[PDB]
């Protein structure tokens, strides 16, 4: 938990609580349950993220007009990592100059792990600037939003020959796809290793030129995300339902008995992984004592999950004993096997009931989380997802926030929590002086929890 300032992502990364936990108690006490290995994948809701480049020139007279570099200058930037010292619309130059000379791009040390930036004049007048940064696009990938907040109505996978299976909504005269385009590895290096990219797309914005490398959708995007694998899974069969339970899990899954076609295109990016995961669980756990029963069956859970199932059946007790080491003896072993199977089915039924016992508790705790998320959404979401998550309350939704790590040694806590500007009012949490990385302007925020630094309106209260 480093000292950090967490800011909300412009209102874009919204999340909300919904009563999506449904409990259906299985009625029959039928005890011939199947055993097997299970892997569960969830529908991928997260947005596809890809790198883009943003080319701009900066005119200052502090008005700081941003303008699009000409496309030939864009080619100069991409091929030589150099930019020309002039811009024309009638003509302007660097301060007190007329050279129209070439300039070598150098790193802007003020730039971060997002929006890594390169400038020709390090003056942190006319400047030339190239930002390399992220962009996100949610399914259907018909538009993407870059980290700088610009929205582009073009599919990140439109390759100039598939507008029937993609989207293009920006101005046609300002869009250019380039086969086998050569771009340098690092704009900040005087000499860098050039790299060819199959299809590179450019779009001339009003104040910018945005470029991105077009890739194959089915090859870069996967609509299913692996959630979890259960090695000891039991399954109860109804007339039109399979009910999956796991002893280590507090969640049970329910699906119809009709299976999903495993040779479907939507499973192409998860099929081999899931199959090998099942095979690994068999090899490391059941290769000796069990045997595979049937093939891999794919089911779609009522809640939308995708289940890959491998049934397993334990070897007969004669084989188990031989690995650990006449008709009447065959009858004795048959009676032993019958007794073992009966009691094992009893155990499996009990385990299934125990697994079902968690649902009401989980539903009530979900309502508890929803109520508590209005007071501290970040703590509640961090508890739910088991990772540091910052969130803000936005009425009926929560906004996810992203945290910028600060100097970590500039954090000075003020000694006086009394609001000098207003007698009778006191700060709720102590005020902090801090500095951003590679920066010197002292900032005033308020100390939060888990080393978080708060900004905006300071929390105040009565001086009790």
């Amino acid at each position, epitope marked *: 938990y480093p000292y950090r300032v967490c800011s909300m992502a412009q209102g874009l990364d919204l999340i909300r609580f919904e009563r999506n936990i449904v409990c259906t108690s299985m009625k029959p006490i039928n005890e011939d349950l199947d055993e097997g290995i299970m892997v569960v994948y969830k529908r991928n809701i997260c947005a596809h993220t890809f790198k883009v480049r943003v080319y701009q020139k900066v005119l200052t007279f502090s008005n700081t007009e941003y303008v699009a570099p000409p496309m030939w200058e864009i080619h100069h930037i991409n091929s030589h990592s150099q930019c020309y010292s002039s811009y024309s619309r009638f003509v302007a130059y660097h301060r007190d100059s007329y050279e129209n000379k070439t300039m070598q791009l150098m790193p802007d040390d003020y730039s971060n792990t997002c929006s890594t930036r390169y400038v020709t004049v390090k003056d942190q007048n006319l400047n030339c600037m190239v930002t390399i940064t992220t962009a996100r696009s949610k399914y259907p990938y018909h538009f993407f939003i870059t980290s700088t907040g610009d929205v582009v109505d073009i599919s990140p996978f*439109y390759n*100039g*020959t*598939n*507008r*029937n299976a993609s989207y*293009f*909504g*920006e*101005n*046609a*005269d300002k*869009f250019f*796809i380039f086969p086998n385009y050569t771009i340098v590895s690092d704009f900040g290096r005087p000499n860098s290793a050039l790299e060819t990219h199959r299809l590179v797309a450019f779009l001339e914005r009003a104040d910018s030129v945005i470029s991105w490398d077009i890739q194959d959708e089915k090859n870069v995007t996967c609509q299913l995300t692996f959630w979890e694998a259960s090695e000891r899974t039991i399954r109860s069969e109804a007339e039109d339902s399979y009910h999956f339970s796991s002893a280590k899990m507090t969640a049970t899954f329910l699906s119809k008995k009709q299976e999903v076609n495993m040779s479907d295109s939507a499973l192409d990016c998860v099929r081999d992984e899931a199959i090998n995961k099942l095979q690994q669980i068999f090899n490391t756990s059941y290769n000796q004592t069990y045997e595979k029963y049937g093939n891999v069956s794919v089911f779609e859970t009522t809640g939308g999950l995708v289940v890959f199932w491998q049934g397993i059946k334990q070897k007969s007790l004669v084989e188990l004993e031989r690995l650990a080491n006449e008709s009447v003896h065959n009858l004795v072993y048959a009676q032993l096997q019958f007794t073992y199977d009966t009691l094992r089915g009893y155990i499996n039924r009990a385990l299934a009931q125990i697994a079902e016992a968690w649902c009401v508790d989980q539903r009530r705790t979900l309502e508890v989380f929803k109520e508590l998320s209005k007071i501290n959404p970040s703590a509640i979401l961090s508890a739910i997802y088991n990772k540091p998550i910052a969130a803000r309350f936005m009425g009926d939704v929560l906004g996810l926030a992203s945290c910028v790590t600060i100097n970590q040694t500039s954090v000075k806590v003020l000694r006086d929590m009394n609001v000098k500007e207003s007698p009778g009012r006191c700060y709720s949490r102590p005020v902090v002086i801090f500095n951003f990385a590679n920066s010197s302007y002292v900032q005033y925020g308020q100390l939060g929890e888990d080393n978080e630094i708060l900004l905006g309106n300071h929390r105040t209260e009565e001086c009790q």
Partner: antibody
């Protein structure tokens, strides 16, 4: 899905004007549609491009038919029209409405040929 | 306009390689990209080669485009009964589009 359908008359006199109109469906004639053009094909002979028009009305004509061919666009009705003037027997042809839809392609989407007999 | 010269017909046996030429001029076919369209009788033309030597998705590898100076070429390899069509070479000349004369092919 760039459906493209013509609405021309089948029989026209060898005089006055042939008016052809092409209607777009599944999309719209907008700032992201490149050009929309007309092509003739006399029966049993090769194709011949007539004219192109853009969404903003900027139009280009073939050198030979520029005087005898007018082209217009109506983005409100998602249509565009050819008017051919001073018709002759040699204007008897199948007329195809076509366009550029993808970036790399030139004439990838073609309409349904309207046979005009002069 | 400057119509691109193209053979009026071509033919070959099934399984043979057929070549269709397109002469043009330096200002028309040498500079701009050349496209090839396959039209079957009574049907609208279908794009067969979009750039000089690039096939749209689903156009068989049997078809290949090429250019040499001004002369563009299409070649059909392993010719099939369903290749009987008119092939049109088309490109820009001066802010204007021009098709070829169309080689009717017979198997």
């Amino acid at each position: 899905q760039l459906q493209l359908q013509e609405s021309g008359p089948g029989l026209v006199k060898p005089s006055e004007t042939l008016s052809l109109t092409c209607t777009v469906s599944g999309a719209s004639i907008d700032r992201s549609t490149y050009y929309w053009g007309w092509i003739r094909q006399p029966p049993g002979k090769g194709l011949e491009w007539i004219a192109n028009i853009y969404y903003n009305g900027r139009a280009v004509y073939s050198p030979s038919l520029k005087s005898r061919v007018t082209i217009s666009v109506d983005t409100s009705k998602n249509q565009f029209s050819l008017k051919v003037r001073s018709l002759t027997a040699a204007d008897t042809a199948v007329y195809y409405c076509a366009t550029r839809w993808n970036y790399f392609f030139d004439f990838d989407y073609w309409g349904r040929g309207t046979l005009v007999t002069v | 306009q400057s119509v691109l010269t193209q053979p009026p017909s071509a033919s070959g046996t099934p399984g043979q390689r057929v070549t269709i030429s397109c002469s043009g001029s330096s200002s028309n076919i040498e500079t701009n990209y050349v496209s090839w369209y396959q039209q079957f009788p009574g049907t609208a033309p279908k794009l067969l080669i979009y750039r000089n030597n690039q096939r749209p998705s689903g156009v068989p590898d049997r078809f290949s485009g090429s250019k040499s100076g001004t002369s563009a070429s299409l070649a059909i390899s392993g010719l099939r009964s369903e290749d009987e069509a008119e092939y049109y070479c088309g490109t820009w000349d001066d802010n204007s589009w021009v098709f070829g004369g169309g080689t009717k092919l017979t198997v």
